Amino acid sequence: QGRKVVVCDNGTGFVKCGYAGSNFPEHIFPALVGRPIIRDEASELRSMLEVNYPMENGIVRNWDDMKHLWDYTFGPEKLNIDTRNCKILLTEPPMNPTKNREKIVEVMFETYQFSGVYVAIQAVLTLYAQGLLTGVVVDSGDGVTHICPVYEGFSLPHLTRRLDIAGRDITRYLIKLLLLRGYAFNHSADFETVRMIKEKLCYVGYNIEQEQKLALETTVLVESYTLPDGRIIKVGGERFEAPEALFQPHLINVEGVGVAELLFNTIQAADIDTRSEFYKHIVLSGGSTMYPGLPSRLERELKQLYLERVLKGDVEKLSKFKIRIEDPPRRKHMVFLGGAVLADIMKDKDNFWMTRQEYQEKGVRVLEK
Amino acid sequence: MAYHSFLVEPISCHAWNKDRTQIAICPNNHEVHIYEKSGNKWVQVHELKEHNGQVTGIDWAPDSNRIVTCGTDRNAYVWTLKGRTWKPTLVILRINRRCVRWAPNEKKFAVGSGSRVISICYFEQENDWWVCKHIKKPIRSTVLSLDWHPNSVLLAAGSCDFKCRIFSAYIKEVEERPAPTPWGSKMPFGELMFESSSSCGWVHGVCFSANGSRVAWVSHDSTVCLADADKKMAVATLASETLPLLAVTFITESSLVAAGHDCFPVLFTYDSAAGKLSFGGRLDVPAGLDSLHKNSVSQISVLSGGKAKCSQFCTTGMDGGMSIWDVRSLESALKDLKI
Amino acid sequence: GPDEGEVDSCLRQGNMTAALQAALKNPPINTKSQAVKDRAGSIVLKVLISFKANDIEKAVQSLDKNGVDLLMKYIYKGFESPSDNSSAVLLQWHEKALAAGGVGSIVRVLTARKTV
Amino acid sequence: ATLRPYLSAVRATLQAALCLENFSSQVVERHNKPEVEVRSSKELLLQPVTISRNEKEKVLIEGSINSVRVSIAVKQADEIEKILCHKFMRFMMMRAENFFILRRKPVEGYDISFLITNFHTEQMYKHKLVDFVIHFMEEIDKEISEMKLSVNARARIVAEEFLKN
Amino acid sequence: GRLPACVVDCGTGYTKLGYAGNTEPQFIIPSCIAIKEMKGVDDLDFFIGDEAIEKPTYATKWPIRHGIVEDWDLMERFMEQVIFKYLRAEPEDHYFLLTEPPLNTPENREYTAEIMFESFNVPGLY
Amino acid sequence: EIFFHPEFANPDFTQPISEVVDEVIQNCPIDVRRPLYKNIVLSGGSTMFRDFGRRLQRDLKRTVDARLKLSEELSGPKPIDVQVITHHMQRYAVWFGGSMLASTPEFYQVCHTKKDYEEIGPSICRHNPVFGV
Numbered sequence A: 001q002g003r004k005v006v007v008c009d010n011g012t013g014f015v016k017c018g019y020a021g022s023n024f025p026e027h028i029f030p031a032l033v034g035r036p037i038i039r040d041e042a043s044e045l046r047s048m049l050e051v052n053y054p055m056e057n058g059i060v061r062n063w064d065d066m067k068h069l070w071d072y073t074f075g076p077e078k079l080n081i082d083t084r085n086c087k088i089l090l091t092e093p094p095m096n097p098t099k100n101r102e103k104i105v106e107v108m109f110e111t112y113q114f115s116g117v118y119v120a121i122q123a124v125l126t127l128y129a130q131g132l133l134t135g136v137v138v139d140s141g142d143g144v145t146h147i148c149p150v151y152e153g154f155s156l157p158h159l160t161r162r163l164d165i166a167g168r169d170i171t172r173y174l175i176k177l178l179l180l181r182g183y184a185f186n187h188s189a190d191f192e193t194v195r196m197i198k199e200k201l202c203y204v205g206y207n208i209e210q211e212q213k214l215a216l217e218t219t220v221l222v223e224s225y226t227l228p229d230g231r232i233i234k235v236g237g238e239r240f241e242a243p244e245a246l247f248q249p250h251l252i253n254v255e256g257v258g259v260a261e262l263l264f265n266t267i268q269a270a271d272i273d274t275r276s277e278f279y280k281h282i283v284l285s286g287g288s289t290m291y292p293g294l295p296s297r298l299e300r301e302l303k304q305l306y307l308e309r310v311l312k313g314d315v316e317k318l319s320k321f322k323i324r325i326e327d328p329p330r331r332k333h334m335v336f337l338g339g340a341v342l343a344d345i346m347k348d349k350d351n352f353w354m355t356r357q358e359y360q361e362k363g364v365r366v367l368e369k
Numbered sequence B: 001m002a003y004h005s006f007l008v009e010p011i012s013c014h015a016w017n018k019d020r021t022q023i024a025i026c027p028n029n030h031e032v033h034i035y036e037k038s039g040n041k042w043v044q045v046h047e048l049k050e051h052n053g054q055v056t057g058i059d060w061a062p063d064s065n066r067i068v069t070c071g072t073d074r075n076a077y078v079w080t081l082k083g084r085t086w087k088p089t090l091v092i093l094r095i096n097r098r099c100v101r102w103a104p105n106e107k108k109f110a111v112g113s114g115s116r117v118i119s120i121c122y123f124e125q126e127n128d129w130w131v132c133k134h135i136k137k138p139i140r141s142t143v144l145s146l147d148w149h150p151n152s153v154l155l156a157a158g159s160c161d162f163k164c165r166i167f168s169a170y171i172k173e174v175e176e177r178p179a180p181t182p183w184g185s186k187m188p189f190g191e192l193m194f195e196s197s198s199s200c201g202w203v204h205g206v207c208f209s210a211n212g213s214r215v216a217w218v219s220h221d222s223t224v225c226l227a228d229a230d231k232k233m234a235v236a237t238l239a240s241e242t243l244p245l246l247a248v249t250f251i252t253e254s255s256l257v258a259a260g261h262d263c264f265p266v267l268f269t270y271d272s273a274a275g276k277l278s279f280g281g282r283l284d285v286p287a288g289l290d291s292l293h294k295n296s297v298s299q300i301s302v303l304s305g306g307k308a309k310c311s312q313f314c315t316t317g318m319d320g321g322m323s324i325w326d327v328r329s330l331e332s333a334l335k336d337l338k339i
Numbered sequence C: 001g002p003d004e005g006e007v008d009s010c011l012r013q014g015n016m017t018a019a020l021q022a023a024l025k026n027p028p029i030n031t032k033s034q035a036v037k038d039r040a041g042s043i044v045l046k047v048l049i050s051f052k053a054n055d056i057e058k059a060v061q062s063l064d065k066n067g068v069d070l071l072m073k074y075i076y077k078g079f080e081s082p083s084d085n086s087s088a089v090l091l092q093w094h095e096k097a098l099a100a101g102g103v104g105s106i107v108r109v110l111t112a113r114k115t116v
Numbered sequence D: 001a002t003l004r005p006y007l008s009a010v011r012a013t014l015q016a017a018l019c020l021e022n023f024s025s026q027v028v029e030r031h032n033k034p035e036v037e038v039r040s041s042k043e044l045l046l047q048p049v050t051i052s053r054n055e056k057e058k059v060l061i062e063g064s065i066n067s068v069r070v071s072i073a074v075k076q077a078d079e080i081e082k083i084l085c086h087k088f089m090r091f092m093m094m095r096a097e098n099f100f101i102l103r104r105k106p107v108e109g110y111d112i113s114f115l116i117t118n119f120h121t122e123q124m125y126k127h128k129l130v131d132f133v134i135h136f137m138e139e140i141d142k143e144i145s146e147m148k149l150s151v152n153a154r155a156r157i158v159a160e161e162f163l164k165n
Numbered sequence E: 001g002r003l004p005a006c007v008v009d010c011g012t013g014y015t016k017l018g019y020a021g022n023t024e025p026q027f028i029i030p031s032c033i034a035i036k037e038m039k040g041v042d043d044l045d046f047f048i049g050d051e052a053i054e055k056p057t058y059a060t061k062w063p064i065r066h067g068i069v070e071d072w073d074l075m076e077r078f079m080e081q082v083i084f085k086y087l088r089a090e091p092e093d094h095y096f097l098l099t100e101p102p103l104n105t106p107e108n109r110e111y112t113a114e115i116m117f118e119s120f121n122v123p124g125l126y
Numbered sequence F: 001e002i003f004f005h006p007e008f009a010n011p012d013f014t015q016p017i018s019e020v021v022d023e024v025i026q027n028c029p030i031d032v033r034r035p036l037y038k039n040i041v042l043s044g045g046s047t048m049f050r051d052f053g054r055r056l057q058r059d060l061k062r063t064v065d066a067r068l069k070l071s072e073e074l075s076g077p078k079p080i081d082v083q084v085i086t087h088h089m090q091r092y093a094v095w096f097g098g099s100m101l102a103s104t105p106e107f108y109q110v111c112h113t114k115k116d117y118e119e120i121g122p123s124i125c126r127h128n129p130v131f132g133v
């Protein structure tokens, strides 16, 4: 009846698009515009192709590339549908400029001439799949690890922090770490390779002292891995020390205190009537939330920063503090599914969605927000 | 006495089909394999790569023809056959942290894990989704082995807390009420009906009888302990000179067979008269090993006959060999073995 | 702990079987005091040390399974303090105990949560 | 003092604490490690047992549900034998990458340390492993003695040759 | 400091040894070592360089195969004679810079480090 | 001539050195490709043969100019500079570079100390710093 609704998440590095209602994404392609100079369709050929990213750290840099990216996202490769005869729902990042949000709908009403549009907050959509009103949505993709606090369907822009450490930075940390270990890899040639190795064997440990101990003393953390060239490398403690920059951002020469310290200093910096509520509902969504062992470390450090500062040494008064974080099994793309749910729910619900006629008559900023 | 060399690595879980026509197993991998039997040689037919880690538990609902599986992937998959492809459905376990078995009712499954909470789970047809309520009362450790009783309302499980408790995971929204059992009258979801008295050794094995009168379990203190509610929940233990047992199952109402780190399937009988357990002996008598499997047994299910009169015993171990046993051949071999 | 005189009488009598059988009575395993456990361990060690080599088989065969486990545990506790060449006698005793109770004895010794 | 029954009780204890199994971490999400090494759960750690054949040479076994750590302190007769033992134990420790049943550092208060993991216990025969330990001890003794004799011989030859010129 | 370090590049077909800072190598020898066809100083009877190519009482062996080392002990003896017999410089009183292949393994670099630091006790290694 | 044509004495090899160098420069980072094609250094004894680098640079620049023309014919490009360097000590360059590195003061700062070797372990020699630029 509504001419097929859809949902598209255009992230920094990985774009995930799926039909509304789908429990997963119906197409997941790498976000990179490629050009030739000689006489997942672009990622296959990158050694001899000039690749560019339209969405830099969440924001769009080159509209001439973003337009073609949209034409390739709605093209006969992944979606294969008419933009003028189908509605859509895009995902936006927290702390985004009003100019960006305006230009988005502007280009979605004029360039693509869509008949339907429905934007929503990624921090809100990520919790929407979990079915909650108040919670902490922390997104760590390839651009930046922004920590957003949501409450009653809204996010305090004065409470939304951000750590400049992303999956790309994890890759660079792993590739830098392996070099010291004795091996040798290139900064640009084996980029995706290093990213894969990190995605595979690397992780985040709970007890850094005990993990370092297990690595130095025992030979149980050391695992082997085969490369594309056929040669094999054996990485040990480098597996965990590389992702450990997520907890302490001083290991990569960055300004900040750490994701755990950021979340904790943003938790105690809330209303005292909401402090016991926001500490019991924290949603983990983003590519960097698939690192085996992040949940335990977050819970532990969050426990530390509310027992050294909130309890101030009081051991007995530590148990009373609620501590419950949920690492969902489908947390890898909660932003997408959360949309795929919303777009399925508000498919034909009243008329709370931007129209083309309302975008052609008047108001490119026709946004009830 | 029919051992089949399938792989070189160890085995995780052993499952069978309704008519025992197909067998399913996992080889400590991110995927689970399903093989059938076409003649003397066996050949693989299905492969499921849904889980994202080493598969720990897997059980197949016979009448329902539907196999559920849950392991290190911190998730559960209620796989059902869809045409020529086994489609898996992600049943949320809701656990922040190694066992699974369907009920006799084949309507809800128990998922005992390291979250110190026996996560029972039924299928809500109202929301077209699986829900998992967690029974965590009086539970201090992971659920090694979980086995149902004939009531399909009371579950038994051994823990790393050196005890084998028999609690109730009865969801009153998926079945009718439960009749009065000898193990108690008050049966509520989360209510602890029974427990062990051991303070040593881990309860790696646990299985209830067919009559539902007695519940036995194997502890890792080189000791096996069977309890009978027929004699006011009397507990009868016995220390084996052999190593610890890993899996425990009953062949008859008074005769059980079990193996483990001893790497050799053993038989035992418990006299209701005196009220004590007795050892039958070594049913598996013949690398360098003196037995079929070159490692410890890891699981032991029943092929056909029931827990009152098993005609064939299926044994999976850490040796990578499928040990198919028969009570008839075993009784024809060892003449000094009273079942 | 155990009683010293009951063992001293059988020791004076020459009947080592009675002394060995009495030394393992009421072992301080549930006890929290390390002194009582040290005393019981030292006592059992003293009992086993004076014993002749060829006669050990009978006395070892006279004990029970639970007693074999308690003796194995006490021997493990005594093994942490090797002195006055008691290690050889404790070794022969460990061999006899191993042959008697099998791997189950030591397994029960390692799996034990409360012991001497 | 020294007997074969010592390495028989050692072999038996090694056989008893080779009953390990794979187990996931209960504290960390999707982590898997040796229980005996980190010692994080007191519920999974068994009572460690020590066996001493003498006041100088002994073997300490610390078992777990998912690990078995065996430390071995060999006999020290002379200073040269001690330096050689340290050097050989170190040389073996460096190749801990090859020996997946040994660890890079020796246990405190022991000569050498080998961590037999549950993963290592699942991909190698327990009987063959016990045999490997026993052979490790007897070979340690014999090889140490042979090395001593060879070294002494070399010193004698060099001294004689230098004196003859 | 006051003295000069030694430089040694072991190639497949020819080994180039000398002192750093010099215009040319102080000794450019062949990559082959003489051996017997064992206890005592049996390892001290080892000849390297050109004086091993055509030995008749001994056997001529090649160590560096395709840039990578195949037999470590032989290369060790060769470096020994290169240090004492060909260079004759105090190892404890001098540093050393060794060359690696393009496909040199990390473990191989580790082993080389072990042989150079533990046996020779070099004051510097690179 | 066996280098310029491997097909002469090897049935299991058909690639000429020109093609090998071309693929090596092309299969690497594009941003450093021009630099790799600019500084082509000959090392080892087997490269001391007369007029080797001349023919090498000839074939390389030939294929390069060809591909450039092909790309400029269908273009609805800048001059690719290529240079094969011939060093004076190209016979033993591997040792020469070492002698030139060890002569600098930085080689005393970069070289792993025996102290660090005994204190930390063999891993101290696992990563050698690069200086001199």
Ligand SMILES: Nc1ncnc2c1ncn2[C@@H]1O[C@H](COP(=O)(O)OP(=O)(O)OP(=O)(O)O)[C@@H](O)[C@H]1O
Pocket (backbone or CB within 6 Å): A010, A011, A012, A013, A014, A057, A058, A139, A140, A141, A142, A143, A144, A166, A167, A168, A170, A171, A195, A199, A286, A287, A288, A289, A290, A291, A292, A332, A333
């Ligand atoms: N198993 C894994 N463990 C840890 N990190 C991973 C894993 N898989 C992918 N990643 C990382 O996640 C990043 C991308 O995640 P994701 O697609 O969820 O965010 P994004 O949409 O690309 O970024 P943003 O939302 O900030 O624009 C990659 O850089 C990758 O390194």
Ligand SMILES: Nc1ncnc2c1ncn2[C@@H]1O[C@H](COP(=O)(O)OP(=O)(O)OP(=O)(O)O)[C@@H](O)[C@H]1O
Pocket (backbone or CB within 6 Å): E010, E011, E012, E013, E014, E015, E031, E066, E067, F043, F044, F045, F046, F047, F048, F049, F091
């Ligand atoms: N005057 C010469 N002109 C050209 N080639 C020569 C000359 N003399 C020797 N060669 C060749 O050079 C080869 C040795 O070269 P080089 O010294 O670069 O290799 P290496 O360093 O010994 O071994 P690797 O290259 O594996 O390190 C010999 O095989 C020989 O055939």
Ligand SMILES: [Ca+2]
Pocket (backbone or CB within 6 Å): A011, A141, A286, A335
């Ligand atoms: Ca995202």
Ligand SMILES: [Ca+2]
Pocket (backbone or CB within 6 Å): E011, E012, F044, F094
């Ligand atoms: Ca060379």
